[PDB]
Design a binder for this molecule. Structure first.
Ligand code: HEM
Ligand code: HEM
Ligand code: HEM
Ligand code: HEM
Ligand code: HEM
Lengths: 242, 242, 245, 242, 242
C-alpha cells in the first residue's frame, strides 16, 4: 500500500520512534558530500513507501538527548527496522548515533470507549483542533508501577476518566496519539503530541501531574523529547550546513 | 557436533546472551574487509561447533541498546567465553562494543512441577505453538527484590501459579525459555521469547504486569531486547552493507 | 535597520521562553591551529548578531566550578523555535562545532501562581519592594527542579502554604541574590528551571540551606543534577578563554 | 620477596581489585607490539614481587563490565597502587580503560568467632574444599544500608548466623574471601569466590537472597564480576591475538 | 596575598576539588613533550600563587573515578576557577578529562562549638595527630535528605554530638577538614581526610555508619576518592612516564 491516513488512524499499527545525535566528524566531511545528503534522505523514505511512512523532526537545541527524531509507522514491525537499517546507510545516517529508540502498537480504546464511558467518549470524538498548524512535537515515554497494574479494571477506569476530564479542553490546540509498548521497550506507552502553543502544552502537563494517576508513574519522560516539525529536506539541510 | 536440540531442551545448560553496537568506523572500512566479515563469522561458529551452539538476531532499529544479539549455549560456561573471545577477534567483532552480556543456567522446574502443582504442570506440558514461524526475539532480564526471596516457598509458589494461569494460553503463539542468573550476573533470571505476533506479546506482558509477583520486580527489562531472527550470514551482511 | 529584540522586556515579562544549554569543549579543539582559535571569538559575536532581532544571549564560564560543562548559554525569545535556530547556528561556529551538549532545558516565564497580591499580599509586598544592593553579580547558579506526584496532587491551598514558607525566609537574600523562575513541565525532564545571579556565594550557600530546611524540600526529586555554577563573562572573554586566546 | 600464602590468609592485608576494557585500537596495533605484551606483563609483575602478589582473570564474554580482572595484595596499600601504575605503562595497560577499582582490607572475624558463635565457628573452621581446582572467579561488591549498621551488635550477629547456617555446605565446592571497604570505596565489602561449579554458585547465592540480611543490601554486585582464572601469560596473549 | 596556613585554617575560604582521568592518547605524545609537562604544571601553580594554593594527589590504581585529584583554596571562588582554566591549558591538562569537580566554603562550627557543646568541643583537642606523616587522602562528598534539614536545630545538634563521640579517638591518626556545599554543588558537604593508617580509617567510617545521622545520607561518597599524597612534580612525572 501503504496509506498515511490509514496508518495514522487505525489500531494494530506499529510506531517506531528513534532519536539520534550527529557525530562531530559529520561537519568535517567535504561540502559536496553534505550537499547530497538531503536528496538521499528523501529518496530512502520514498524507497520504503510501500511499507512504511516516515516523519522527521529537529530536536537540536531543545534538549540534550538528540539532534533529530524519526517517527516511522507500518503494520509490520520488521518493515520499520528495515527502513531504519537503510536510513543508517545514508550519509547522514552513517554519522548518526542512536540515543533512544522505542516501539509500540496502536490499539482500540481500553477505557474511554462509548461502552465504558459514553459522556467522555462523546467529548473525545467531537473535539476539533482549531489553532494554527502545529510547529512542535513532544514525545513522552510512560511507564506505570506494578501497583497501577494490580488495580482492578474499574479502579483504573476511574483514574483514566480523571485523566480525561481536564484535558479534553486541550484538544483545540494539542494533537495526541497513543502507542502501547509493554513487552517491547522499557515503557508501557509512548505518547506523541503536536502543538503550536507550548504555553498551553506546559499547562496541559501540569493538569496531568496533579491527578492521582501520576502517583503511579515510574517513567514520564526521560527523555521528554521536544522538537520542531520539519520536512526531511529542511531537517537534513539544517544538520548538514546546507 | 554439539547437539542443538538437547542443548535447548535440557537442564544444566549455560545460556550466554550478549548485545553489541557496531562502531561508527566499521562502515568506513574498505569494502573488502566488510565483504570478508560474513565468512569469518561462519568460520568462528564452525570452529566451536563441538562445544557450543550460536543464534544471531538483528536489534538495530528496534531499540537503542544494541545493533545485534548473540545467544550461545554450552554445558561448559568457559566454552561460551572462548567462543565470544574468538567472535570479538573477527572483523565485525573487533568493531563491536559490547553493551550487555548476561549468563545463566537452565534448571528443573522450581514451582510448576508435577510434584508441586500438577494441574498447571499438565497445562504447561499440554501446550503447543501453532502460529507461523517466529520472526522476533525478546530478551527480558529479571531481578526480584529481597522481600520476594524472603517469602516462604509456599507464598512464592502461590504467586508463580498466578503467573502461570493467564500465560498458558500464549503458548499457542509465544515460545519461552527461562535461565537462572543469581550470583552470575546482576539479574535473577534471563527470559527469552520467540514470536511472530508482537501484538500478542504486548498483551502477554500486560497480563503479567497485573499480577502481584510484579510488585517484586526491581529489574524487568533494562534492557528489553527486541530483535528479528536472522541467519548469521544475513546478520553480518546487513551490518556490513553487503 | 529592523529593531533588536528588547532585552529588558524579554527578561521581565511572562510568556517568554528561556533556553539553557551547557557544553563541554572537545579535547581536539585545542589541537586546532592558532589562527582558527583566534577567529572563534568573532564568529561567536557574528552569530549572536545574526539573531539579535529574535533572541537575546548570555554566556557564562563553568569550567573549573563543576564537572558537567565548560560553558553555559541562556537564550530567550517569545518564539521557542527561534532559540533553537540560534543554537543551531551556534553549533556551526568553530567553537560550537567542537562543543558537546551536556544539558539543554527549556521553560516559559509565567505570572505568579502563589505569592501574588491577591493570594498572599504581605509576602507579595515584600517580594515587590526588595532591591538588590550588592556589587555587580559575578556568578550564576542554575538549578533544575522537579517535584514528586504527591506535591502536585496536593490542593491549591496546601501548595500555597508551602510556597509561603519557601518565601518567608528567603526574602532577606534579595539584597544580594537575583532570582528568575522558568516553568518546564512537559517541555523537559523538570518542572522548573531556577536562575540566580550573585557576587556572594557564602550568602547563596546560606540561602539554599534555608530552603533545604522547609517542608517543600521533602517533595524534590530533582534539585540540581546538575547544579550549574559559573562566572558571568562576555561572549568575547568566554570564547577567548576556552580557545587559549 | 612477598609471601603469597601469608598474604592470602592473614588479617591486615590490602586487596586491590580492578577491571579493565581493552580499547578498540589495541588490536589495530602492529603484530610485533602485541607480541611483546606478554613479556612486558611478566616483567612488571616480577618488578613488584617484593611487595605485592598479582592474580589475573579473563572476564571478556562473561559480562559487559570488563575484559580482565586484576587482584593485587600487599600490606602497603600504596604498593598496590604502584604496581597498577606500572601495569598501566605496559603496552596492554596503555590500551586498557579501567572500569571498576575497589580496595579493602582483610580482618579478623567480627561475628562468627569462637567466642560469639561457637557452633557455627566450628563448622566454618572444619569445612574443607573437596572439589576439583577452581576455574571461575566471582567478585561481588556489597553495601548495606544505614538501618543495618544502626542495628545492635546482637541484632547483626543474629543475621550473620542466619547467613552462615545455610551456606557452610557450599564450602565443599566454593572458596570465599572477605575484604572490608567502608570508607575506602563505595562499598562496605568486597567478596571474592573461586569455584569450578557455577551451578552450585547460583544455588549458594539464591540461599543468601532468601535471608533477612538481604533486605539491607543497597549494592550486591553492580558489577557482579564473573571470569575465568588464567595465568598472566595466557591472559595477555588471549587479549593480544597471540 | 594568599597565605597557606591561613587559607587552611580560617572560615570563609573556598575549597575546589577536581578529579581527572588522563586520556589514552597522552602517552602517545613524544617523550620530549611529556618530559616538559611537570615544569609546566609547577609554573601554572606559581602563576596563581598570589590568589590560590594547590595540593596534588595520585588516585590512579586506588579507584576507577580518576587518575589524579587537585585541591585548590582561595578566598575568591572565581580565582580557583581561573587557576583550573590555566591548568587545563597545560600539556597534562589538555589531555585530562574532568570526572568530578565540587566546591564549597569553610565555616565556623555549627554544632560542636564551645557555646553549644563544651565537653565535646574541648575533646576535639584531647589528642593530636601522632602517627607517621600522612600518606593517603580520602575525599567524601556528603548530602543529607530533606528530613534531616527539616529537623530542629536541637535535634540535629544531638545527632552531631553522636557523630563526634566515636570520632575523637581517631584524632591520633586521621586529619579532617569540612567544607559546606549546599547550593554550590550536588552535595551539602565535602569532607577531606589525611592518614597513614587506612585500617584505622575503615574503622572510623564504620563507627559513623552506625549512628542515626547516617540514616539521612543520600550521598556519602559516589565517589569516595582515595589517593596518595604526592608533590606536583612527582604526580606529573608519574602520569607522564618520566
Ligand atoms: C491532550 C489532551 C489529552 C487527552 C484528551 C487525553 C485523553 C486520553 C484518553 C481518552 C485516554 C484513554 C485511552 C484508552 O481508553 O485506551 C488517554 C490515555 C493516556 N494518556 Fe492521555 N490525554 C491527553 C494528554 C496526555 C498527555 C499530555 C500525556 C502525557 C504523558 C498522556 C498520557 C496518556 C497515557 C500514558 C495514557 C494511557 C493510560 C493507560 O492506559 O493506563 N495523555 N488519554
Ligand atoms: C509465554 C507464556 C509464559 C508462560 C506459559 C510462563 C510460564 C512460567 C512458568 C511455568 C514458570 C515457573 C518455572 C518453574 O517452576 O521453575 C515461569 C517462571 C518465570 N517466568 Fe514465565 N511464563 C511466560 C511468560 C513470561 C514472561 C513474558 C516473562 C517476562 C518477564 C516471564 C518471566 C518469568 C520469570 C522471571 C520466571 C521465574 C520466576 C521465579 O522463579 O521466581 N514469563 N513462567
Ligand atoms: C533568592 C531568594 C528567593 C526568593 C525570595 C524566592 C521566592 C519565591 C517565590 C515568591 C516563589 C513563588 C512564585 C509564584 O508564585 O509563582 C518561588 C518559587 C520557586 N522558587 Fe524560589 N525564591 C528564592 C530562591 C530560590 C532558590 C535558591 C531556589 C532553588 C533552589 C528556588 C526555587 C523555587 C522554585 C522551584 C519555585 C517554584 C515553586 C512551585 O511553583 O511549586 N527559589 N520562589
Ligand atoms: C560460600 C559460603 C559462604 C559462607 C560459608 C559464608 C560465611 C560467612 C561468614 C562466617 C561471615 C562472617 C565473617 C565475620 O564474622 O566477620 C560472612 C560474612 C559475609 N559474607 Fe559470607 N559466606 C559465604 C558466601 C557468601 C556470598 C556468596 C556472599 C555474596 C554476597 C557473601 C557475602 C558476605 C558479606 C558481605 C559478609 C560481611 C557481612 C557483614 O559483616 O555485615 N557470603 N560470610
Ligand atoms: C576523623 C574524625 C572526625 C571527627 C573528630 C569529626 C568531627 C566532626 C565535628 C566536630 C563536626 C561538627 C562540625 C560543626 O559543628 O560545624 C563534624 C561534622 C561533620 N562530619 Fe565529621 N568528624 C570526623 C570524621 C568524619 C568522617 C569520616 C566523615 C564522613 C564520612 C565526616 C562527615 C562529617 C559531616 C558531613 C559533617 C557535617 C555535619 C552537618 O553539618 O550536618 N566526619 N564532624
Amino acid at each position: 500500500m501503504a496509506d498515511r491516513a490509514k496508518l495514522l488512524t487505525t489500531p494494530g499499527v506499529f510506531g517506531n520512534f528513534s532519536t539520534y545525535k550527529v557525530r562531530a566528524d559529520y561537519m568535517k566531511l567535504p561540502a559536496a558530500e553534505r550537499k547530497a545528503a538531503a536528496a538521499e534522505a528523501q529518496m530512502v523514505i520514498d524507497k520504503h513507501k510501500d511499507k512504511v511512512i516516515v516523519d522527521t523532526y529537529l530536536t537540536r537545541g531543545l534538549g540534550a538527548g538528540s539532534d533529530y527524531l524519526l517517527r516511522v509507522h507500518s503494520t509490520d514491525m520488521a518493515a520499520t527496522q528495515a527502513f531504519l537499517v537503510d536510513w543508517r546507510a545514508t550519509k547522514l545516517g552513517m554519522y548518526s548515533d542512536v540515543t533512544e529508540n522505542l516501539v509500540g502498537i496502536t490499539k482500540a480504546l481500553n477505557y474511554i470507549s462509548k461502552d465504558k464511558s459514553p459522556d467522555l467518549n462523546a467529548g473525545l470524538s467531537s473535539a476539533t483542533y482549531s489553532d494554527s498548524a502545529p510547529r512542535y512535537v513532544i514525545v513522552i515515554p510512560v511507564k506505570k508501577d506494578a501497583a497501577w497494574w494490580n488495580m482492578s479494571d474499574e479502579q483504573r477506569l476511574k483514574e483514566i476518566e480523571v485523566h480525561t476530564q481536564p484535558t479534553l479542553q486541550y484538544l483545540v490546540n494539542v494533537k495526541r496519539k497513543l502507542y502501547h509498548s509493554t513487552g517491547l521497550a522499557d515503557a508501557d506507552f509512548i505518547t506523541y503530541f503536536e502543538t503550536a502553543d507550548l504555553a498551553a502544552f506546559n499547562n496541559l502537563l501540569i493538569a496531568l501531574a496533579k491527578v492521582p494517576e501520576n502517583t503511579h508513574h515510574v517513567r514520564w519522560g526521560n527523555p521528554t523529547v521536544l522538537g520542531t516539525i520539519q520536512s526531511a529536506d529542511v531537517l537534513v539541510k539544517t544538520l548538514s550546513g546546507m
